Symmetry: C3
Subunit: 242 residues, 3 copies
């Protein structure tokens, strides 16, 4: 039983659906733990392919802005330990992992796209990482992945300067596999994924592994560096005023 | 020795050297330039010849309507004394060595992609210096459909060149690209209309071959040398994986 | 402090370093190498949030000045390779967001350094040319590493090895340039954006850049060193000796 996700599995696809549509799928502490539990189950289940998507209008508005005796410094520590573990589940996820981006995506839900195998977007999806505007720094391994996927010249605009991308721009810049018109989005994506799930399953998993294994150690080191820096930013005056 | 004069005779290739350019042409056009055991070996020989001749630039291209359908699946081989296992090992050693020749090739190496390209002939494109395509070339790596895994260093190069989100569709899910898509995604340098393709590309290559010859070579070396060690390790790892996949049920059934 | 070949200003949280030999298409002479390094050193310590590099007049920069003793040509190529190395090293290490405002044609080292910038904005009149091979030379500015990664090997080759000159639109499509603007609106569009950028939280800007760049710097410094070594030799080859005399003639 999940309180913040709807998780199903059938015919070789596991579907993990963010389910706080009244909060535009903001990721609160509970959803952090539950996404990790869903991923850990999906890593051992019978599915060939695992899909993340959002209920409703938004894919996700990112971290929930609403969440101790040992202080703001110890809440910072425990939040960093948790972020690091959460990102770690995406670095390690051993099967094909697909984002179906049904609408606007923000923050950590965008930065994680650099660790997904494929990303399909509705043309009403947008991609925004306004870290800078909130006195914070990158996470989700995006400090490593975004310059490499997008080019430094483009990644700067998104990561440092908080420019919001359209679906088309995110696709042209390598974050998004393909964009579909919103009225046909759901059909186009599921039809494709159902075909993909009929491919030889050990071949799909083994092909992902030969692509991803040699990079994991570096991604885990990137993730640890990001979380350490981010712990600092949370305790900063710019983060508080913003 | 691999010395020759103007043309080097092969059974599955046409190998010629004029205007400072050694041209290696797949020549099993009836079989869509499918690469059999004989062609793996002749290609490695042709590359050794090309690295040592007086060409400035080297081209790989196909005869007829296809660049290459990739590995020849009609090329059925007897099982040797150590069984299908020994056969999978033998084949893995040969692939590793074949890819290694592309990793190490020291002159500018250009692909002239005249028509459809499949498999190993596509994955190798990530080790090339330039790739020119006809607008009727297509690019297809249907490894998963055959119960196999990536080779040619593509498990490393394609994500980096195309982005992970585009490389996945091609490598894991077997999507076939048009020439325009392959160029948009970084694998192809430039696409030309089929009707003037050969004219335009060869005009350009003949110009390039008149550039200061040693500078061409030294610049490629400064770009490529520091990566070769990693590429070699990637190739070895892909070949070890594939050795296991060739013995799998999924691979058998797929044939 | 005080500049012969640059104009350096600072306002609205932006330090602007402008190449200032417009009668030589902002060619970079030995003096400008040393000045750019002193300017970047100062900009790194001043209270600006963003630093910009641009060129005065019609060119960004035509790149190295070909006009450029005690141990003859042997020890000279050595000095020049030591200076090139130090010059490129300042870009690798520069700690604040570094932006290129490419006002017209760029050539040579002015192009290759763009792989070390944070953002790059171009006028549609700008072009990008690295004719190193034509000149009998090899790559620098870390371009041997950075350009295949940014542009794809297949496109980097055409630039670096074969001397293709890119339009602003092509450079942008291939990852080198952030955004291209019509020449008539370029200055206004860029500076408006940059002025808004300079108002974002400055420690977040600086620290974001740091988490992006820091872990790559070692590698970049190695690539720089290797490139300067090769180039030290190329400068003493018949193809370069010979090419430089032909360009003397232009
Ligand atoms: Cl957190
Ligand atoms: Cl084989
Ligand atoms: Cl110099």
């Amino acid at each position: 039983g999940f309180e913040t996700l709807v998780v199903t599995s059938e015919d070789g696809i596991t579907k993990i659906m963010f389910n706080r549509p009244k909060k535009k799928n903001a990721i609160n502490t509970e959803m952090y733990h539950e996404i990790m539990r869903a991923l850990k189950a999906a890593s051992k289940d019978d599915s060939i392919i695992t899909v993340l998507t959002g209920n409703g209008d938004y894919y996700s508005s990112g971290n929930d802005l609403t969440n101790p005796p040992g202080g703001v410094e110890e809440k910072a520590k425990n939040n960093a330990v948790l972020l690091r573990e959460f990102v770690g589940c995406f670095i390690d996820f051993p099967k094909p992992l697909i984002a179906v981006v049904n609408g606007p995506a923000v923050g950590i839900s965008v930065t994680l796209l650099g660790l997904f195998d494929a990303v399909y977007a509705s043309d009403r999806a947008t991609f925004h990482t306004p870290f800078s505007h909130l006195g914070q720094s990158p996470e989700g391994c995006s400090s490593y992945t975004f310059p490499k996927i997008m080019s430094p010249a483009k990644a700067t605009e998104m990561l440092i300067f908080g420019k919001k991308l359209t679906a088309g721009e995110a696709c042209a810049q390598g974050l998004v596999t393909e964009v579909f018109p919103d009225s046909t989005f759901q059909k186009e994506v599921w039809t494709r994924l159902k075909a993909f799930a009929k491919l030889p399953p050990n071949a799909l998993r083994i092909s992902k592994e030969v692509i991803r294994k040699r990079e994991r150690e570096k991604l885990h080191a990137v993730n640890a560096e990001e979380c350490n820096v981010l712990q600092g930013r949370w305790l900063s005056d710019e983060c508080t005023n913003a």
